[PDB]
RNA sequence: CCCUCGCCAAGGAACUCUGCAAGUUGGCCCCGUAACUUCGGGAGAAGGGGUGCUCCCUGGGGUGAUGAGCCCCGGGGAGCC
RNA sequence: UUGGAGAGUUUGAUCCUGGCUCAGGGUGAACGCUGGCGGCGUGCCUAAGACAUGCAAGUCGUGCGGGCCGCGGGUCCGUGGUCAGCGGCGGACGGGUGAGUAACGCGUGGGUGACCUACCCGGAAGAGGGGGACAACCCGGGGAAACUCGGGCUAAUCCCCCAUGUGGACCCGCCCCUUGGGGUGUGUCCAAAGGGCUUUGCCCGCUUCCGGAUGGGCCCGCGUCCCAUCAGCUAGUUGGUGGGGUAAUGGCCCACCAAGGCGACGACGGGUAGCCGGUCUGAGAGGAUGGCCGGCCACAGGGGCACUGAGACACGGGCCCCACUCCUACGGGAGGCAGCAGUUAGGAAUCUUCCGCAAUGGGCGCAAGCCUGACGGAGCGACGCCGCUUG
RNA sequence: AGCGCCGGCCAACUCCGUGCCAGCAGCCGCGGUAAUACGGAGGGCGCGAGCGUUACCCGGAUUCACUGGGCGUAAAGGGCGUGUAGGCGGCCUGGGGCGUCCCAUGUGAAAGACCACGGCUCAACCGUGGGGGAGCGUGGGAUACGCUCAGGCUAGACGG
RNA sequence: CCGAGGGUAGGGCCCGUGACUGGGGCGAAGUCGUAACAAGGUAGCUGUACCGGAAGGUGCGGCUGGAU
């Protein structure tokens, strides 16, 4: 199904993800439907995570599925806060 | 019953398609070759870029004849064509494959390779 | 030198049988009603034609027929029969 | 939207089909001058009500035949045999262009 | 043994001065047809498909009368040995 | 307005014309001489030649019945494991290659009242009762192997019938619409599967229907190389009617009817080429190019074919033909690296038979988790750029 | 620490050896007993873990010229008419608004590219944010020019 | 029925190759003459035709891009 996950960008030993909504059948770094934030697992910068919480909730609502460690990061941005 | 002038189908993948017997190699004056006999022949038709070409003088063993061949058990066998497999002077096939059935007489005359490569031995 | 691709192939041959079976049966009873309707014979046509439609939608439960193919096939059946019975009439049953 | 085209009917020798010549202009991509190019579309005429020389509009449509992807939309003008003749004179000139 | 004739396993011009002789081919309908050419031809080039009988449907012509009958030239289906 | 340099060379000398030549930048490069380190890239453009060996797609016992071992204990029971089997789901993604293709293949903007979409999400309703088969297993016959054939039993989320009809499907009439869009009336037709826990409650599933979202198919306008020493091409050809076929339009396919369709705005034919985002160059215009990354297309030794399926005419699925190769006990069998490595051949020339699923992602699973040569990394090469040393 | 080069273009000069030989060469050209041009040496110039060479692409090449060329004698006017298609077309007024111009709007994926900031000690590389554009879809607007339809005109052309 | 392909026959295009043959380019240290550039010793050039070892000649017509 359509999914919300981490497309790796950046470079070798310098991981930089764009948390993204794409068809599951896409290649990991392939054309995606929309970008809804970034993530820098190494915290090399003050904001190593951003999430358009507005847009993310929409995709969730309309049937998208987060990966586990995307849902983790999506949690940290409080998309699931009721 | 193959003799000089007789055309034979070649039942291998050497590239020869038709050969014309010019001698039966069986003594000083054998009249006819049958299955298991060797002939010298001219290559009369050949597909492009084969191992043998038109005009070549080759040796071959007769593996099929239209004249029925008689067996000691009182049976006989006969084919629709006269066919040969092109060989070298070790009686070894110059090709890698042989097509169509071949007569079992080949085995006894020492053409083991050819007999085993054949799809059927009758 | 092996796989569950083998399993998948075995399964396809069993599903193969069933799809053909249903499809044949549908084709038979379809043309049958149409033949009756031709010389209609209204009650008999519709009786058989009722049986064809059943086998059709039943085929579309599973993989045999797509719903639209079923819809298409029913449409042509009923369209054919009515137009055929129209040479003479009268429709003795349903439907419709 | 469905594409709408204007042109002349240069053939009606077909059953329920007319041939509509359509012209377009544009500046040459490199040499700038404005140039003319034309194209013939096979148009659906279910009433066979369209006559040679009619200026019509055709609208992009679901396939009717192999090569027919346009219906005739409406009449625009009539009796443009003057245009039809320019098409025909050129085709006529082609016998002179062989060897 | 000779003449005229018929058939022949496998081979298929190996015959002979020479395929001499003898085979092959062979009518009609249809498809199709090269170099070259003086544009006529070459051409029946070559090569190939069809061919009987039965039933059903049908198109024109001649004689009648415009019709039946007779006679002529076709066409399309489905079959049988 | 951030952007534009020229020089050598025809003469005894001159101006002009004109070609040749050079200085610049660029490369998936190669060759010579030389060669210390590191990072990030990057590396068969030739034979889409041929390939030894391993690996590149599996998972689920919370769908089912068993074989073997094992743990607990009373042959039975639980249970754990293992193994295949039956049944799901994935295997149509991901990965490779650029042969073919001058095409609606691609780019771009549009159409579909002519269409499909598994899993996911939201909303509506529902799961009543019967019956049957095939493997496993057993028993035989046949093999060197591939494996195989026959008879006999047995379960299920396997198959079938009946009911129920929320609803949907189809014919005909009516209203709205306006290409086959929505609504309604009679008839006719169609549902289902259970499992697991902590057990009159839950979770995972199953069923019909509307919708959403995602992914697609088809169609259209315009753009897409060279040769006119290729100038005429066309019988499924162009249109119609009717059928067949599809998810759906269409000569897509068929039957008949008509004689049309296309071309100097280059048809037809020949040659070359996968196309684009981009890339290199250039003052710009333009020229050149499309490897690496991204998107789309096409192919899976050559060719045809359909089956299963939501989706394939399917790289590591099936059938057949061909070419080629191999095994054999000589009776017969097997194979498809343009997946990752690796071999050989060809070439001026192009890499390790490495590590790991820790991350990211994908499949299956309630979950643990399993699989993942995608991937993350390590190896080799001054191949490229960048940084550093020999003070 | 190496590689190329030191006649001119083009930055870097002397001695010896050779004597139209051996050889160099991208073009022009060097070599025939005092060679900055061959071979070595000293010296010098230029780059530096590289330096040179071959191949190919764009540039210099306004040398296919749209921007931005030409045809008396340099390469270049068809031997000459006639005329088909096509290209192009006088003065005035109105309709339409096709080209053309303007505004709004959708599309123009990500990467790359350009400006800024930031992360690997810098860089390469990589992350984050920013600004566009042509082109095409749609909506509204303008009418000079070109087009088209209509009506006049006489200066072109034709006729008496 | 269609159908991969196979077979028979006949055409079309392209490539490689061929005894021999035609001319061409380059070489140059040769042989023959000297056609053109001066009025180049016959002004030149030209289309065509016929001819000659060769450059070339001559006819017919044309051009001046001809010296005096
Ligand atoms: Mg054979
Ligand atoms: Mg020969
Ligand atoms: Mg399985
Ligand atoms: Mg039947
Ligand atoms: Mg179905
Ligand atoms: Mg139609
Ligand atoms: Mg007599
Ligand atoms: Mg005989
Ligand atoms: Mg005979
Ligand atoms: Mg013969
Ligand atoms: Mg013969
Ligand atoms: Mg003789
Ligand atoms: Mg003799
Ligand atoms: Mg003779
Ligand atoms: Mg004779
Ligand atoms: Mg005869
Ligand atoms: Mg006869
Ligand atoms: Mg005769
Ligand atoms: Mg001939
Ligand atoms: Mg002759
Ligand atoms: Mg002739
Ligand atoms: Mg004949
Ligand atoms: Mg002849
Ligand atoms: Mg015949
Ligand atoms: Mg017959
Ligand atoms: Mg008779
Ligand atoms: Mg008879
Ligand atoms: Mg009479
Ligand atoms: Mg009569
Ligand atoms: Mg400027
Ligand atoms: Mg310059
Ligand atoms: Mg000079
Ligand atoms: Mg000069
Ligand atoms: Mg000089
Ligand atoms: Mg110059
Ligand atoms: Mg360079
Ligand atoms: Mg090197
Ligand atoms: Mg070395
Ligand atoms: Mg590293
Ligand atoms: Mg490296
Ligand atoms: Mg290779
Ligand atoms: Mg390759
Ligand atoms: Mg090869
Ligand atoms: Mg090989
Ligand atoms: Mg493994
Ligand atoms: Mg387990
Ligand atoms: Mg299992
Ligand atoms: Mg599947
Ligand atoms: Mg795939
Ligand atoms: Mg792929
Ligand atoms: Mg990859
Ligand atoms: Mg690779
Ligand atoms: Mg390609
Ligand atoms: Mg082509
Ligand atoms: Mg398009
Ligand atoms: Mg196009
Ligand atoms: Mg598009
Ligand atoms: Mg499925
Ligand atoms: Mg049971
Ligand atoms: Mg029911
Ligand atoms: Mg389950
Ligand atoms: Mg139709
Ligand atoms: Mg389909
Ligand atoms: Mg067609
Ligand atoms: Mg037909
Ligand atoms: Mg006809
Ligand atoms: Mg056109
Ligand atoms: Mg052209
Ligand atoms: Mg080609
Ligand atoms: Mg290609
Ligand atoms: Mg320039
Ligand atoms: Mg290209
Ligand atoms: Mg490339
Ligand atoms: Mg790519
Ligand atoms: Mg293929
Ligand atoms: Mg294949
Ligand atoms: Mg291969
Ligand atoms: Mg294959
Ligand atoms: Mg199916
Ligand atoms: Mg495919
Ligand atoms: Mg493979
Ligand atoms: Mg597969
Ligand atoms: Mg397959
Ligand atoms: Mg083996
Ligand atoms: Mg083995
Ligand atoms: Mg054995
Ligand atoms: Mg077999
Ligand atoms: Mg293997
Ligand atoms: Mg490989
Ligand atoms: Mg090698
Ligand atoms: Mg080699
Ligand atoms: Mg390798
Ligand atoms: Mg690598
Ligand atoms: Mg993993
Ligand atoms: Mg995971
Ligand atoms: Mg899951
Ligand atoms: Mg659990
Ligand atoms: Mg595995
Ligand atoms: Mg591995
Ligand atoms: Mg890697
Ligand atoms: Mg390095
Ligand atoms: Mg240098
Ligand atoms: Mg000097
Ligand atoms: Mg310099
Ligand atoms: Mg200097
Ligand atoms: Mg010397
Ligand atoms: Mg030198
Ligand atoms: Mg001197
Ligand atoms: Mg000296
Ligand atoms: Mg020098
Ligand atoms: Mg020197
Ligand atoms: Mg460096
Ligand atoms: Mg250049
Ligand atoms: Mg230029
Ligand atoms: Mg110009
Ligand atoms: Mg000039
Ligand atoms: Mg002029
Ligand atoms: Mg001149
Ligand atoms: Mg003139
Ligand atoms: Mg004129
Ligand atoms: Mg005119
Ligand atoms: Mg005009
Ligand atoms: Mg004007
Ligand atoms: Mg006006
Ligand atoms: Mg106006
Ligand atoms: Mg306008
Ligand atoms: Mg825009
Ligand atoms: Mg962009
Ligand atoms: Mg920094
Ligand atoms: Mg810009
Ligand atoms: Mg507009
Ligand atoms: Mg006027
Ligand atoms: Mg006047
Ligand atoms: Mg006058
Ligand atoms: Mg065929
Ligand atoms: Mg064929
Ligand atoms: Mg075959
Ligand atoms: Mg010669
Ligand atoms: Mg003279
Ligand atoms: Mg003289
Ligand atoms: Mg003179
Ligand atoms: Mg003369
Ligand atoms: Mg002479
Ligand atoms: Mg003489
Ligand atoms: Mg004379
Ligand atoms: Mg004269
Ligand atoms: Mg004159």
Swiss-Prot record, chain A:
<dbReference type="GO" id="GO:0003735">
    <property type="term" value="F:structural constituent of ribosome"/>
</dbReference>
<keyword id="KW-0687">Ribonucleoprotein</keyword>
<dbReference type="InterPro" id="IPR000307">
    <property type="entry name" value="Ribosomal_bS16"/>
</dbReference>
<dbReference type="GO" id="GO:0015935">
    <property type="term" value="C:small ribosomal subunit"/>
</dbReference>
<dbReference type="GO" id="GO:0005737">
    <property type="term" value="C:cytoplasm"/>
</dbReference>
<comment type="function">
    <text>Binds to the lower part of the body of the 30S subunit, where it stabilizes two of its domains.</text>
</comment>
<keyword id="KW-0689">Ribosomal protein</keyword>
<dbReference type="InterPro" id="IPR023803">
    <property type="entry name" value="Ribosomal_bS16_dom_sf"/>
</dbReference>
<dbReference type="GO" id="GO:0006412">
    <property type="term" value="P:translation"/>
</dbReference>
<dbReference type="Pfam" id="PF00886">
    <property type="entry name" value="Ribosomal_S16"/>
</dbReference>
<comment type="similarity">
    <text>Belongs to the bacterial ribosomal protein bS16 family.</text>
</comment>
<comment type="subunit">
    <text>Part of the 30S ribosomal subunit.</text>
</comment>
Curated annotation (Swiss-Prot), chain B:
<keyword id="KW-0694">RNA-binding</keyword>
<comment type="similarity">
    <text>Belongs to the universal ribosomal protein uL14 family.</text>
</comment>
<keyword id="KW-0699">rRNA-binding</keyword>
<comment type="subunit">
    <text>Part of the 50S ribosomal subunit. Contacts protein L19. Forms a bridge to the 30S subunit in the 70S ribosome, contacting the 16S rRNA.</text>
</comment>
<comment type="function">
    <text>Contacts the 16S rRNA of the 30S subunit in two different positions helping to form bridges B5 and B8.</text>
</comment>
<dbReference type="GO" id="GO:0070180">
    <property type="term" value="F:large ribosomal subunit rRNA binding"/>
</dbReference>
<dbReference type="Pfam" id="PF00238">
    <property type="entry name" value="Ribosomal_L14"/>
</dbReference>
<dbReference type="GO" id="GO:0006412">
    <property type="term" value="P:translation"/>
</dbReference>
<comment type="function">
    <text>This protein binds directly to 23S ribosomal RNA.</text>
</comment>
<dbReference type="InterPro" id="IPR005745">
    <property type="entry name" value="Ribosomal_uL14_bac-type"/>
</dbReference>
<keyword id="KW-0687">Ribonucleoprotein</keyword>
<dbReference type="GO" id="GO:0003735">
    <property type="term" value="F:structural constituent of ribosome"/>
</dbReference>
Curated annotation (Swiss-Prot), chain C:
<dbReference type="GO" id="GO:0006412">
    <property type="term" value="P:translation"/>
</dbReference>
<dbReference type="GO" id="GO:0070181">
    <property type="term" value="F:small ribosomal subunit rRNA binding"/>
</dbReference>
<comment type="subunit">
    <text>Part of the 30S ribosomal subunit.</text>
</comment>
<dbReference type="Pfam" id="PF01649">
    <property type="entry name" value="Ribosomal_S20p"/>
</dbReference>
<comment type="similarity">
    <text>Belongs to the bacterial ribosomal protein bS20 family.</text>
</comment>
<dbReference type="InterPro" id="IPR002583">
    <property type="entry name" value="Ribosomal_bS20"/>
</dbReference>
<keyword id="KW-0687">Ribonucleoprotein</keyword>
<keyword id="KW-0699">rRNA-binding</keyword>
<keyword id="KW-0689">Ribosomal protein</keyword>
<keyword id="KW-0694">RNA-binding</keyword>
<dbReference type="InterPro" id="IPR036510">
    <property type="entry name" value="Ribosomal_bS20_sf"/>
</dbReference>
<protein>
    <recommendedName>
        <fullName>Small ribosomal subunit protein bS20</fullName>
    </recommendedName>
</protein>
Curated annotation (Swiss-Prot), chain D:
<comment type="function">
    <text>One of the primary rRNA binding proteins, it binds directly to 16S rRNA where it helps nucleate assembly of the platform and body of the 30S subunit by bringing together and stabilizing interactions between several different RNA helices. The combined cluster of proteins S8, S12 and S17 appears to hold together the shoulder and platform of the 30S subunit.</text>
</comment>
<dbReference type="InterPro" id="IPR012340">
    <property type="entry name" value="NA-bd_OB-fold"/>
</dbReference>
<keyword id="KW-0694">RNA-binding</keyword>
<dbReference type="InterPro" id="IPR019979">
    <property type="entry name" value="Ribosomal_uS17_CS"/>
</dbReference>
<dbReference type="GO" id="GO:0019843">
    <property type="term" value="F:rRNA binding"/>
</dbReference>
<dbReference type="GO" id="GO:0022627">
    <property type="term" value="C:cytosolic small ribosomal subunit"/>
</dbReference>
<dbReference type="GO" id="GO:0003735">
    <property type="term" value="F:structural constituent of ribosome"/>
</dbReference>
<protein>
    <recommendedName>
        <fullName>Small ribosomal subunit protein uS17</fullName>
    </recommendedName>
</protein>
<dbReference type="InterPro" id="IPR019984">
    <property type="entry name" value="Ribosomal_uS17_bact/chlr"/>
</dbReference>
<comment type="subunit">
    <text>Part of the 30S ribosomal subunit. Contacts protein S12.</text>
</comment>
<dbReference type="Pfam" id="PF00366">
    <property type="entry name" value="Ribosomal_S17"/>
</dbReference>
<comment type="similarity">
    <text>Belongs to the universal ribosomal protein uS17 family.</text>
</comment>
């Amino acid at each position: 199904m359509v999914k919300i996950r981490l497309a790796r960008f950046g470079s070798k030993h310098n991981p930089h993800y764009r948390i993204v909504v794409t068809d599951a059948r896409r290649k990991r770094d392939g054309k995606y439907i929309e970008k809804i934030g970034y993530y820098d697992p190494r915290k090399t910068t003050p904001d190593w995570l951003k999430v358009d919480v507005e847009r993310a909730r929409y995709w969730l609502s309309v049937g998208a599925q987060p990966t586990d460690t995307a849902r983790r990061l999506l949690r940290q941005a409080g998309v699931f806060r009721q | 019953m193959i003799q000089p002038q007789t055309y034979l189908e070649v039942a291998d993948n050497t590239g020869a398609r038709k050969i014309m017997c010019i001698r039966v190699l069986k003594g000083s004056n054998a009249k006819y070759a049958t299955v298991g006999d060797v002939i010298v022949a001219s290559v009369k038709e050949a597909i492009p870029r084969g191992a043998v070409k038109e005009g070549d003088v080759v040796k071959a063993v007769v593996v099929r004849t239209k004249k029925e061949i008689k067996r000691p058990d009182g049976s006989a066998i006969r084919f629709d064509d006269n066919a040969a497999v092109i060989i070298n002077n070790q009686l070894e096939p110059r090709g890698t494959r042989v097509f169509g059935p071949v007569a079992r007489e080949l085995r006894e005359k020492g053409f083991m390779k050819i007999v085993s490569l054949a799809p059927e031995v009758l | 030198r092996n796989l569950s691709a083998l399993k998948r192939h075995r399964q396809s041959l069993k599903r193969r049988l069933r799809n053909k079976a249903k499809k044949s049966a549908i084709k038979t009873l379809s043309k049958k009603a149409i033949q009756l309707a031709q010389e209609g014979k209204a009650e008999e046509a519709l009786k058989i034609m009722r049986k064809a439609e059943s086998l059709i939608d039943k085929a579309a439960k599973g993989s045999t027929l797509h719903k639209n193919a079923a819809a298409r096939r029913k449409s042509r059946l009923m369209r054919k029969v009515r137009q055929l019975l129209e040479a003479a009439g009268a429709p003795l049953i349903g439907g419709g | 939207p469905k594409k709408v085209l204007t042109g002349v009917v240069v053939s009606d020798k077909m059953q329920k089909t007319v041939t509509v010549l359509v012209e377009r202009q544009f500046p040459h991509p490199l040499y700038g001058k404005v140039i003319k190019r034309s194209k013939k579309y096979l148009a659906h005429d279910p009433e066979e009500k369209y006559k040679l020389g009619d200026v019509v509009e055709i609208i992009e449509s679901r396939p009717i035949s192999k090569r027919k992807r346009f219906r005739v939309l409406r009449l625009v003008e009539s009796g443009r045999m003057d245009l039809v003749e320019k098409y025909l004179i050129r085709r006529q000139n082609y016998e002179s262009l062989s060897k």
